[PDB]
Amino acid sequence: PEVKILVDRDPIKTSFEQWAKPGHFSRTIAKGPDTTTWIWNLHADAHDFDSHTSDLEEISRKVFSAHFGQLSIIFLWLSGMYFHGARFSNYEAWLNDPTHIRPSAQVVWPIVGQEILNGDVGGGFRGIQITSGFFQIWRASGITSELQLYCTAIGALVFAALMLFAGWFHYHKAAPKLVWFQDVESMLNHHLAGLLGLGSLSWAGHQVHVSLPINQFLNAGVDPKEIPLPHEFILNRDLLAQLYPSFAEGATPFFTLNWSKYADFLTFRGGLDPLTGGLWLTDIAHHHLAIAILFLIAGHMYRTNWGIGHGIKDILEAHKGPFTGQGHKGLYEILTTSWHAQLSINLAMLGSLTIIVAHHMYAMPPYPYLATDYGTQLSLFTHHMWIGGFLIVGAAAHAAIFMVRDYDPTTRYNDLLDRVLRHRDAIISHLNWVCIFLGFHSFGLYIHNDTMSALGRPQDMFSDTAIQLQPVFAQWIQNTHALAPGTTAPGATTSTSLTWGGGDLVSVGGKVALLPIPLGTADFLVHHIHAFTIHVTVLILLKGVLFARSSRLIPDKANLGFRFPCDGPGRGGTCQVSAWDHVFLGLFWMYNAISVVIFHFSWKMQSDVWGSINDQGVVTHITGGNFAQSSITINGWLRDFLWAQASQVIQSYGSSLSAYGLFFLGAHFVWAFSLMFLFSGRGYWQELIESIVWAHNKLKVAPATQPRALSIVQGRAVGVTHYLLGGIATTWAFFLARIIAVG
Amino acid sequence: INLPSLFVPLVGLLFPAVAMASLFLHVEKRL
Amino acid sequence: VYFDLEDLGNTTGQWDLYGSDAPSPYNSLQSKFFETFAAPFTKRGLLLKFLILGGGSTLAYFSATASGDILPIKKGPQLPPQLGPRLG
Amino acid sequence: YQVVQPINGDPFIGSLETPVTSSPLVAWYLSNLPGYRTAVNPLLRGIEVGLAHGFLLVGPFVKAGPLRNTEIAGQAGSLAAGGLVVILSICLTIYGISSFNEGDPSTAPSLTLTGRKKQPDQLQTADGWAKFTGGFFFGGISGVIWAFFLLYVLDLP
Amino acid sequence: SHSVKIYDTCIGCTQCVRACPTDVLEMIPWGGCKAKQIASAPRTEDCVGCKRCESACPTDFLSVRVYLWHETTRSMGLAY
Amino acid sequence: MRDLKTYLSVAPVASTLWFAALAGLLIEINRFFPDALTFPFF
Amino acid sequence: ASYKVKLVTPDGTQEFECPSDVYILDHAEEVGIDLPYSCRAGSCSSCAGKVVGGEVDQSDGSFLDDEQIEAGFVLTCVAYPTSDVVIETHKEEDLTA
Amino acid sequence: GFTPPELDPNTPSPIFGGSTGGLLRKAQVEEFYVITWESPKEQIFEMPTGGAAIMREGPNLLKLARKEQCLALGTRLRSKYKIKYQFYRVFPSGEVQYLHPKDGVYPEKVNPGRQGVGVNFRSIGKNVSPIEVKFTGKQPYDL
Ligand code: CLA
Ligand code: CLA
Ligand code: CLA
Ligand code: CLA
Ligand code: SF4
Ligand code: FES
């Protein structure tokens, strides 16, 4: 019953003998190769732990140490970032004049003329302009010399070696047993209150003592070398009390409960800092304090060892009603015995979180001098949207794996799962219908618009000038968010973001940081397109999950596995009935949806947000503001967005942006190369390999590991992999060349 | 009296109408 | 137990779930009127041939004699035409 | 207690019972509609059908078509709804022609919700379907006529 | 209905009959092999044409063969 | 140690080493004799 | 090397000597104690059998349950006798269940 | 020669809650199938159409819509449980048809009362070319 550490000593012995025998984990691979197919299987099943064995203890041990390996890798990548900022960068000069020096932390050797890629990034330096936004983080951190960057690179290297050693240790010397892993209450109590609570408390601490004073000094105009070191602020406190008088009373308020006396540096202002175009640091510190309090309290909910707390089984069993039978009874047994269920829930939530991060970081810019660095903002939004989409699709993959390999009503029965399984037909019917209806009423409007614009009938269009479709609720909500500070939020001064409105515009260095974003007919059309794409992706993935075990077409589908090519050409033909094929199809639709999302954001920001402002105060946007009138037809997307903005990348040959021109074309090539794998089948290829093998046999030069054509599933997987790489890399080159060139 | 004013409609509207009802009734007929 | 070889329709579920089988709620003066006046359109071949040829009649008619306020294709051009890149 | 039950206690028919498909209000309503008035002359039901649907199909063709603002042609766009009525009654006719033959009984179910025999619904005939076709069509054109007759200003013409 | 044919190279391993999902195949006595067994296909009006039997046959070349032919309700696997 | 010598001769490691050495060789050749379009010797 | 093999069988129990690099079936073929086979390729259950002692190399065995090689059954025609073994014959159906 | 069992209606059915995967119009007008088995006790099992059902102690009688459904359920019942099953085809006439196992034995075991259907006495490499059968309706494998 009680909670304790439980470990085994020396489960596996460190040895090299298993390195020299490829495929030790699976009995079939261990036997050795006859054909080349072997070499592929060896890699495809490398991390399929619960298929190498049946024992849950072994799978969990492997998972734990694999996680340690991943963390060691991440630390090594961080070490590289800090070392490159310290050694091959122009960070100090950029610190001196942030709105003229464009950041760069990678230089190239002069080998074959490639030194042309070392371009003039300002500050007496020649290299590659980076878009990860690391200078903004390092400035918001208080870092002012390259010695601090060196120090953090060394610390990260140490931490990476530590992670690798712990990964070896917990697998070969002290391996925890199943009962240790299966304690979820203590785990949640630690991650809620220990990892997230103590983490943000410690970080709020660092912001109160380092970031806040060093940024106060930097915004005051002081030379970044004549600013005191951070530790001085801790040794001598009069330095702090000069900038914030409240630091004279020094924790007497926090006990005397007169927290009011800290209003110096813990504020609730809202809006941006009109000097750097970022959020007030005095708001972020107070935010982190509040979040830490909330998490530290929330990490005391579940019972571990002292009676007080909540039993998860009790909470789940308590919830049930007259529509759902016995629901939630039997989910604790499931969520503690399958890793795939846990992975699906976790992937779904982390993907959604990443998308939310993208939106919130464009709309309320956290770092100083990030809002006016347009390339970094575009890069960050796009990167995080792609990551979120991929993780959401993996969620479906592992829900399907759970349904095929783990669901079992004979020993672990849950009611809600059973009822959803018992009306899946109606579920899929209604979702299918709503996607068809949503597709007619959003893309159809575009087709109507194109045809009315080509037929010389613009008064019959769907636009702000002819037939208006104003999103009344969105306008109503942002009007409520405009009037909020002072009426429904008396403690706030400015509202949360500048996109809500109120007529407030923030500029930095003659550039536009933020201003109110206008919603119109075009915004209405684009958002309904987005609803359409998300609904279709959901239909494909949920159909794959709900029918993973059986169908009216193939009534014993679970016996064929999770990843199989087909069940033959009979029954009419049954290619791609497996759930793996549904994941394979959903990847294309996720690509479609995310691509449209990033195109909508990129065109809208340049058209109505970004630009340059004059001393008289007349804003000139990068594009002329043509999103309201050209986004409503398809021809306007092809003409005013793709054709007009690809100019920067198709003209980079000879400049320092020529690598983007090379990658544009390479990515087009890789995309078109995948269609060969996607459009064909392996019978043709094996028959061609036959004749090539004959030719080799004619000269006693034929190989002993007989060459085969790829698998059916491998053909599909190579196809989708190259398709995604080609498409995403094309958009990557286009975006980066375009945004870097104009500004 | 405008010649396309008559031929474009009926070849565009009624010819396919009659031909589609025609072929539907024929193709779903069990002799 | 829902299997009875004698009555098959109850075993395979041939019910009418929403039919009524109640008497007519349209009292006969109203029904009288309709089934008197609405009869001649109740033969299949009759209705089909009539509908086709009458719809075609109305379409050819309203197409040959539509006015300019309706169809810009009828009002013709009202401007002098341009010359092409060389020709015209 | 639970709300969803298998259809009439038979848990091996491909359906269920809910407050959406078997509820007293919904049952009584759907029962008193023309399509579910089994014991009534096909032509009367068709008349109700065509009336309601011509009247309904008036509005959109008027308030959205190409001549919506031109009102020397804005209101008389009921021509369009008349044409739509004509077209889908031609479709009704060919459907009935292909789906039935007079020398064959009507395919409707003979059992009721409790297990009593019914006289098969005659709308599923060939004869009665042609009768219902005539009824729907008569109603549709004259309903177009009726809702064009009310051109008097109300709240939104 | 599809066609299924058995050829005299059969070694009577029964692997094809175990695999059929619609019970088309059958073992019958014979005298041409060590097993005194041979496959037969008496019920080809129920064959969905999945070729699950052909994937199971070990002889080179195959001893059971499925030729897809005219389609019906049972052959297409329709539940409606 | 013998097992390590075997492992180092497995296909991916062997090819990695072979091509890294080849790359160094061609890189140094081109660093010494840059921009060659012809055989200018004989 | 050439360990002695023991096969219970309805005919009795007989021994024959035969090197470890061989399959059991061809070695019972040598001395002439008849056994039931169909495939000789490891893709059916006619040559099935279980063990009394020792254990037999089943590297090149296929079409078996992820257990049939951990609870006793063995196919005689794809099996290398690593030890002085003692095995069963005519064991298909109590394997077929 | 192995009289086949009769269909005994009034045989109870498993305990199911209903599902949208069961019979449809094809069972009203074309055909459907019926499986019966023994079930030493009451136990839970996965329906070949939807979720889970409870089979009753004693005879069990299920109505499905395809032969493949019956056979997949029977395979599950016969290996994971040790149960004997039979299934039948019922027409809209009210006519039953014992279907499986046909002659009392399972087809993977050779029974001495069976004839050969679809057996060619030659190898597959000895079929004629299509040119030999052109304009006459046979097929090269017909022989
Ligand atoms: C295959 C040759 C051919 C083609 C491609 C066309 C194409 C066209 N004709 Mg034309 N026509 C043709 C032959 C052809 N015609 C001949 C031989 C005559 C008699 C000398 C005419 C007399 C004619 C008139 C009076 C008019 C057109 C018009 C038109 C245009 C409007 C579309 C239409 O209403 O269809 C054509 C309508 C017809 C009544 C043509 C009927 C006569 C031809 C022979 C019918 C052939 C159908 C045949 C059974 C199918 C052949 C198979 C194959 C074509 C698929 C269109 C671009 C209209 C126009 O100018 O638009 C602005 C117009 O009013 N046509
Ligand atoms: C290829 C031949 C063809 C022709 C000749 C037309 C002609 C016409 N179309 Mg059309 N269209 C076509 C193909 C064609 N279309 C196709 C393939 C599509 C699919 C993309 C469309 C989609 C389309 C749309 C979405 C719309 C039109 C509309 C129109 C009308 C616009 C001008 C107007 O306002 O008239 C005058 C106004 C009227 C109301 C005239 C009505 C015509 C009579 C009175 C109807 C009587 C019907 C009769 C009883 C029987 C029906 C046909 C019968 C002969 C079989 C016009 C009569 C517009 C319209 O007006 O809607 C009706 C419009 O909304 N078309
Ligand atoms: C306050 C206690 C605490 C803390 C801080 C953590 C923290 C973490 N746990 Mg953990 N866990 C705890 C208690 C705690 N756990 C308990 C009580 C249990 C059950 C008995 C588990 C069971 C558990 C499992 C099964 C897994 C984790 C994992 C993780 C990592 C999650 C991924 C991440 O966000 O990386 C963030 C990265 C950082 C914050 C970098 C700093 C890393 C610091 C040094 C972590 C040190 C905390 C650790 C408890 C130190 C103890 C070791 C000590 C004896 C020397 C993370 C570092 C995952 C993992 O192990 O990945 C390897 C995972 O698989 N935990
Ligand atoms: C926390 C994240 C996570 C984790 C731990 C896992 C873990 C696992 N997944 Mg999974 N998955 C995830 C996310 C994750 N996945 C996401 C986001 C997706 C959506 C794409 C999927 C979709 C997915 C599928 C469809 C499948 C799995 C499968 C598996 C299992 C075996 C994986 C394996 O070893 O294959 C081997 C790994 C490789 C062969 C490497 C592939 C290399 C890729 C294709 C190249 C990528 C290009 C690179 C990024 C850039 C180009 C570089 C180049 C130019 C040099 C394993 C337990 C498999 C399974 O059967 O589950 C039981 C299965 O088929 N996953
Ligand atoms: S082998 Fe290929 S083409 Fe044939 S049924 Fe399978 S997936 Fe389809
Ligand atoms: S003969 Fe069947 S396994 Fe050897």
PDB file of all heavy atoms in Angstrom, chain A residues 418-438:
ATOM      1  N   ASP A 418     -16.871   1.076 -24.175  1.00  0.00           N
ATOM      2  CA  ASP A 418     -17.762   0.098 -24.785  1.00  0.00           C
ATOM      3  C   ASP A 418     -18.937   0.771 -25.489  1.00  0.00           C
ATOM      4  O   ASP A 418     -19.320   0.370 -26.593  1.00  0.00           O
ATOM      5  CB  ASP A 418     -18.234  -0.880 -23.710  1.00  0.00           C
ATOM      6  CG  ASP A 418     -19.459  -1.653 -24.113  1.00  0.00           C
ATOM      7  OD1 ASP A 418     -19.338  -2.571 -24.944  1.00  0.00           O
ATOM      8  OD2 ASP A 418     -20.546  -1.355 -23.581  1.00  0.00           O
ATOM      9  N   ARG A 419     -19.491   1.830 -24.894  1.00  0.00           N
ATOM     10  CA  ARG A 419     -20.637   2.502 -25.508  1.00  0.00           C
ATOM     11  C   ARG A 419     -20.235   3.274 -26.760  1.00  0.00           C
ATOM     12  O   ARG A 419     -20.967   3.284 -27.767  1.00  0.00           O
ATOM     13  CB  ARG A 419     -21.299   3.430 -24.498  1.00  0.00           C
ATOM     14  CG  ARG A 419     -22.180   2.712 -23.516  1.00  0.00           C
ATOM     15  CD  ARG A 419     -22.202   3.408 -22.178  1.00  0.00           C
ATOM     16  NE  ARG A 419     -23.212   2.827 -21.305  1.00  0.00           N
ATOM     17  CZ  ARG A 419     -24.454   3.278 -21.204  1.00  0.00           C
ATOM     18  NH1 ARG A 419     -24.840   4.327 -21.910  1.00  0.00           N
ATOM     19  NH2 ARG A 419     -25.308   2.687 -20.390  1.00  0.00           N
ATOM     20  N   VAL A 420     -19.081   3.941 -26.723  1.00  0.00           N
ATOM     21  CA  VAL A 420     -18.601   4.597 -27.933  1.00  0.00           C
ATOM     22  C   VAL A 420     -18.375   3.569 -29.033  1.00  0.00           C
ATOM     23  O   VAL A 420     -18.716   3.795 -30.204  1.00  0.00           O
ATOM     24  CB  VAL A 420     -17.328   5.404 -27.637  1.00  0.00           C
ATOM     25  CG1 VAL A 420     -16.748   5.951 -28.921  1.00  0.00           C
ATOM     26  CG2 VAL A 420     -17.638   6.516 -26.674  1.00  0.00           C
ATOM     27  N   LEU A 421     -17.814   2.416 -28.670  1.00  0.00           N
ATOM     28  CA  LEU A 421     -17.659   1.352 -29.649  1.00  0.00           C
ATOM     29  C   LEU A 421     -19.004   0.880 -30.172  1.00  0.00           C
ATOM     30  O   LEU A 421     -19.099   0.428 -31.317  1.00  0.00           O
ATOM     31  CB  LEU A 421     -16.887   0.193 -29.034  1.00  0.00           C
ATOM     32  CG  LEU A 421     -15.401   0.488 -28.862  1.00  0.00           C
ATOM     33  CD1 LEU A 421     -14.712  -0.623 -28.106  1.00  0.00           C
ATOM     34  CD2 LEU A 421     -14.765   0.708 -30.214  1.00  0.00           C
ATOM     35  N   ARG A 422     -20.051   0.981 -29.364  1.00  0.00           N
ATOM     36  CA  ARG A 422     -21.342   0.476 -29.797  1.00  0.00           C
ATOM     37  C   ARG A 422     -22.165   1.480 -30.597  1.00  0.00           C
ATOM     38  O   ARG A 422     -23.209   1.093 -31.129  1.00  0.00           O
ATOM     39  CB  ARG A 422     -22.140  -0.021 -28.592  1.00  0.00           C
ATOM     40  CG  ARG A 422     -22.055  -1.525 -28.418  1.00  0.00           C
ATOM     41  CD  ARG A 422     -22.556  -1.982 -27.069  1.00  0.00           C
ATOM     42  NE  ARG A 422     -23.795  -1.319 -26.693  1.00  0.00           N
ATOM     43  CZ  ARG A 422     -23.940  -0.597 -25.591  1.00  0.00           C
ATOM     44  NH1 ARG A 422     -22.924  -0.452 -24.759  1.00  0.00           N
ATOM     45  NH2 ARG A 422     -25.098  -0.023 -25.319  1.00  0.00           N
ATOM     46  N   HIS A 423     -21.746   2.747 -30.706  1.00  0.00           N
ATOM     47  CA  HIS A 423     -22.415   3.638 -31.671  1.00  0.00           C
ATOM     48  C   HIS A 423     -21.441   4.376 -32.600  1.00  0.00           C
ATOM     49  O   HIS A 423     -21.758   5.466 -33.121  1.00  0.00           O
ATOM     50  CB  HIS A 423     -23.322   4.636 -30.961  1.00  0.00           C
ATOM     51  CG  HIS A 423     -22.584   5.633 -30.130  1.00  0.00           C
ATOM     52  ND1 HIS A 423     -21.896   5.285 -28.989  1.00  0.00           N
ATOM     53  CD2 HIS A 423     -22.425   6.967 -30.275  1.00  0.00           C
ATOM     54  CE1 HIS A 423     -21.350   6.365 -28.465  1.00  0.00           C
ATOM     55  NE2 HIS A 423     -21.651   7.396 -29.229  1.00  0.00           N
ATOM     56  N   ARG A 424     -20.250   3.807 -32.808  1.00  0.00           N
ATOM     57  CA  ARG A 424     -19.296   4.379 -33.760  1.00  0.00           C
ATOM     58  C   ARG A 424     -19.898   4.704 -35.127  1.00  0.00           C
ATOM     59  O   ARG A 424     -19.437   5.637 -35.795  1.00  0.00           O
ATOM     60  CB  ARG A 424     -18.102   3.438 -33.937  1.00  0.00           C
ATOM     61  CG  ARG A 424     -18.429   2.078 -34.495  1.00  0.00           C
ATOM     62  CD  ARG A 424     -17.285   1.112 -34.241  1.00  0.00           C
ATOM     63  NE  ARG A 424     -17.575  -0.217 -34.764  1.00  0.00           N
ATOM     64  CZ  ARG A 424     -16.690  -1.205 -34.830  1.00  0.00           C
ATOM     65  NH1 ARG A 424     -15.454  -1.021 -34.399  1.00  0.00           N
ATOM     66  NH2 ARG A 424     -17.044  -2.379 -35.323  1.00  0.00           N
ATOM     67  N   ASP A 425     -20.911   3.958 -35.571  1.00  0.00           N
ATOM     68  CA  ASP A 425     -21.480   4.206 -36.895  1.00  0.00           C
ATOM     69  C   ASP A 425     -22.135   5.575 -36.967  1.00  0.00           C
ATOM     70  O   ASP A 425     -21.880   6.352 -37.896  1.00  0.00           O
ATOM     71  CB  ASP A 425     -22.497   3.130 -37.247  1.00  0.00           C
ATOM     72  CG  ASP A 425     -21.872   1.932 -37.887  1.00  0.00           C
ATOM     73  OD1 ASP A 425     -21.275   2.089 -38.968  1.00  0.00           O
ATOM     74  OD2 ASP A 425     -21.972   0.831 -37.312  1.00  0.00           O
ATOM     75  N   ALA A 426     -22.990   5.886 -35.996  1.00  0.00           N
ATOM     76  CA  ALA A 426     -23.602   7.206 -35.952  1.00  0.00           C
ATOM     77  C   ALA A 426     -22.551   8.291 -35.764  1.00  0.00           C
ATOM     78  O   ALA A 426     -22.643   9.370 -36.370  1.00  0.00           O
ATOM     79  CB  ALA A 426     -24.642   7.262 -34.838  1.00  0.00           C
ATOM     80  N   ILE A 427     -21.538   8.022 -34.932  1.00  0.00           N
ATOM     81  CA  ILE A 427     -20.485   9.021 -34.732  1.00  0.00           C
ATOM     82  C   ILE A 427     -19.846   9.405 -36.066  1.00  0.00           C
ATOM     83  O   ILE A 427     -19.780  10.590 -36.439  1.00  0.00           O
ATOM     84  CB  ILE A 427     -19.430   8.503 -33.741  1.00  0.00           C
ATOM     85  CG1 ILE A 427     -20.053   8.268 -32.369  1.00  0.00           C
ATOM     86  CG2 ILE A 427     -18.297   9.489 -33.627  1.00  0.00           C
ATOM     87  CD1 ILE A 427     -19.146   7.537 -31.422  1.00  0.00           C
ATOM     88  N   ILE A 428     -19.364   8.402 -36.801  1.00  0.00           N
ATOM     89  CA  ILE A 428     -18.651   8.676 -38.037  1.00  0.00           C
ATOM     90  C   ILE A 428     -19.590   9.255 -39.082  1.00  0.00           C
ATOM     91  O   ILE A 428     -19.183  10.119 -39.868  1.00  0.00           O
ATOM     92  CB  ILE A 428     -17.935   7.402 -38.522  1.00  0.00           C
ATOM     93  CG1 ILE A 428     -16.729   7.116 -37.626  1.00  0.00           C
ATOM     94  CG2 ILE A 428     -17.460   7.541 -39.953  1.00  0.00           C
ATOM     95  CD1 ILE A 428     -15.964   8.345 -37.227  1.00  0.00           C
ATOM     96  N   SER A 429     -20.863   8.846 -39.082  1.00  0.00           N
ATOM     97  CA  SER A 429     -21.827   9.426 -40.016  1.00  0.00           C
ATOM     98  C   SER A 429     -21.954  10.932 -39.827  1.00  0.00           C
ATOM     99  O   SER A 429     -21.857  11.705 -40.791  1.00  0.00           O
ATOM    100  CB  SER A 429     -23.192   8.765 -39.837  1.00  0.00           C
ATOM    101  OG  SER A 429     -23.066   7.394 -39.528  1.00  0.00           O
ATOM    102  N   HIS A 430     -22.184  11.368 -38.589  1.00  0.00           N
ATOM    103  CA  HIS A 430     -22.405  12.793 -38.361  1.00  0.00           C
ATOM    104  C   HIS A 430     -21.146  13.604 -38.628  1.00  0.00           C
ATOM    105  O   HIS A 430     -21.220  14.711 -39.178  1.00  0.00           O
ATOM    106  CB  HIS A 430     -22.903  13.037 -36.940  1.00  0.00           C
ATOM    107  CG  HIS A 430     -24.251  12.457 -36.670  1.00  0.00           C
ATOM    108  ND1 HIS A 430     -24.448  11.111 -36.458  1.00  0.00           N
ATOM    109  CD2 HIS A 430     -25.469  13.035 -36.583  1.00  0.00           C
ATOM    110  CE1 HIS A 430     -25.731  10.884 -36.253  1.00  0.00           C
ATOM    111  NE2 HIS A 430     -26.370  12.035 -36.322  1.00  0.00           N
ATOM    112  N   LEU A 431     -19.979  13.081 -38.242  1.00  0.00           N
ATOM    113  CA  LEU A 431     -18.751  13.826 -38.516  1.00  0.00           C
ATOM    114  C   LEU A 431     -18.502  13.954 -40.019  1.00  0.00           C
ATOM    115  O   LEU A 431     -18.140  15.035 -40.510  1.00  0.00           O
ATOM    116  CB  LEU A 431     -17.571  13.162 -37.812  1.00  0.00           C
ATOM    117  CG  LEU A 431     -16.189  13.798 -37.941  1.00  0.00           C
ATOM    118  CD1 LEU A 431     -16.220  15.272 -37.641  1.00  0.00           C
ATOM    119  CD2 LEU A 431     -15.252  13.100 -36.996  1.00  0.00           C
ATOM    120  N   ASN A 432     -18.709  12.866 -40.768  1.00  0.00           N
ATOM    121  CA  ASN A 432     -18.631  12.916 -42.223  1.00  0.00           C
ATOM    122  C   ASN A 432     -19.540  14.000 -42.788  1.00  0.00           C
ATOM    123  O   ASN A 432     -19.126  14.809 -43.638  1.00  0.00           O
ATOM    124  CB  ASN A 432     -19.005  11.542 -42.781  1.00  0.00           C
ATOM    125  CG  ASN A 432     -19.077  11.512 -44.288  1.00  0.00           C
ATOM    126  OD1 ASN A 432     -19.987  12.064 -44.889  1.00  0.00           O
ATOM    127  ND2 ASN A 432     -18.126  10.838 -44.905  1.00  0.00           N
ATOM    128  N   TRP A 433     -20.791  14.038 -42.321  1.00  0.00           N
ATOM    129  CA  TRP A 433     -21.720  15.028 -42.847  1.00  0.00           C
ATOM    130  C   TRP A 433     -21.230  16.440 -42.576  1.00  0.00           C
ATOM    131  O   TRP A 433     -21.278  17.305 -43.459  1.00  0.00           O
ATOM    132  CB  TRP A 433     -23.113  14.863 -42.253  1.00  0.00           C
ATOM    133  CG  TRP A 433     -23.933  16.077 -42.537  1.00  0.00           C
ATOM    134  CD1 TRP A 433     -24.538  16.384 -43.708  1.00  0.00           C
ATOM    135  CD2 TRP A 433     -24.186  17.174 -41.657  1.00  0.00           C
ATOM    136  NE1 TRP A 433     -25.179  17.590 -43.612  1.00  0.00           N
ATOM    137  CE2 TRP A 433     -24.976  18.096 -42.360  1.00  0.00           C
ATOM    138  CE3 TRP A 433     -23.836  17.458 -40.338  1.00  0.00           C
ATOM    139  CZ2 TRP A 433     -25.424  19.279 -41.790  1.00  0.00           C
ATOM    140  CZ3 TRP A 433     -24.280  18.633 -39.777  1.00  0.00           C
ATOM    141  CH2 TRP A 433     -25.062  19.530 -40.500  1.00  0.00           C
ATOM    142  N   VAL A 434     -20.803  16.706 -41.342  1.00  0.00           N
ATOM    143  CA  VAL A 434     -20.471  18.085 -41.019  1.00  0.00           C
ATOM    144  C   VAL A 434     -19.237  18.524 -41.784  1.00  0.00           C
ATOM    145  O   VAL A 434     -19.132  19.692 -42.162  1.00  0.00           O
ATOM    146  CB  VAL A 434     -20.324  18.290 -39.498  1.00  0.00           C
ATOM    147  CG1 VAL A 434     -19.029  17.708 -38.979  1.00  0.00           C
ATOM    148  CG2 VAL A 434     -20.413  19.762 -39.161  1.00  0.00           C
ATOM    149  N   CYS A 435     -18.312  17.608 -42.083  1.00  0.00           N
ATOM    150  CA  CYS A 435     -17.173  18.015 -42.904  1.00  0.00           C
ATOM    151  C   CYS A 435     -17.597  18.330 -44.334  1.00  0.00           C
ATOM    152  O   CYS A 435     -17.097  19.293 -44.925  1.00  0.00           O
ATOM    153  CB  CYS A 435     -16.069  16.961 -42.894  1.00  0.00           C
ATOM    154  SG  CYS A 435     -15.551  16.401 -41.268  1.00  0.00           S
ATOM    155  N   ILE A 436     -18.526  17.558 -44.906  1.00  0.00           N
ATOM    156  CA  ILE A 436     -18.989  17.891 -46.257  1.00  0.00           C
ATOM    157  C   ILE A 436     -19.681  19.255 -46.275  1.00  0.00           C
ATOM    158  O   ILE A 436     -19.418  20.102 -47.142  1.00  0.00           O
ATOM    159  CB  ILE A 436     -19.916  16.798 -46.810  1.00  0.00           C
ATOM    160  CG1 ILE A 436     -19.253  15.429 -46.751  1.00  0.00           C
ATOM    161  CG2 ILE A 436     -20.280  17.112 -48.235  1.00  0.00           C
ATOM    162  CD1 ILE A 436     -19.904  14.405 -47.656  1.00  0.00           C
ATOM    163  N   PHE A 437     -20.581  19.484 -45.315  1.00  0.00           N
ATOM    164  CA  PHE A 437     -21.281  20.764 -45.255  1.00  0.00           C
ATOM    165  C   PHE A 437     -20.312  21.921 -45.039  1.00  0.00           C
ATOM    166  O   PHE A 437     -20.476  22.993 -45.631  1.00  0.00           O
ATOM    167  CB  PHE A 437     -22.334  20.731 -44.151  1.00  0.00           C
ATOM    168  CG  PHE A 437     -22.695  22.086 -43.608  1.00  0.00           C
ATOM    169  CD1 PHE A 437     -23.773  22.780 -44.113  1.00  0.00           C
ATOM    170  CD2 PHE A 437     -21.978  22.648 -42.569  1.00  0.00           C
ATOM    171  CE1 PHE A 437     -24.108  24.011 -43.613  1.00  0.00           C
ATOM    172  CE2 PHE A 437     -22.303  23.886 -42.075  1.00  0.00           C
ATOM    173  CZ  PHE A 437     -23.371  24.565 -42.592  1.00  0.00           C
ATOM    174  N   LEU A 438     -19.309  21.737 -44.176  1.00  0.00           N
ATOM    175  CA  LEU A 438     -18.354  22.802 -43.907  1.00  0.00           C
ATOM    176  C   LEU A 438     -17.471  23.074 -45.109  1.00  0.00           C
ATOM    177  O   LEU A 438     -17.040  24.212 -45.315  1.00  0.00           O
ATOM    178  CB  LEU A 438     -17.488  22.436 -42.707  1.00  0.00           C
ATOM    179  CG  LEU A 438     -17.314  23.462 -41.592  1.00  0.00           C
ATOM    180  CD1 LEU A 438     -18.661  23.902 -41.049  1.00  0.00           C
ATOM    181  CD2 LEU A 438     -16.483  22.860 -40.492  1.00  0.00           C
TER     182      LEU A 438
END
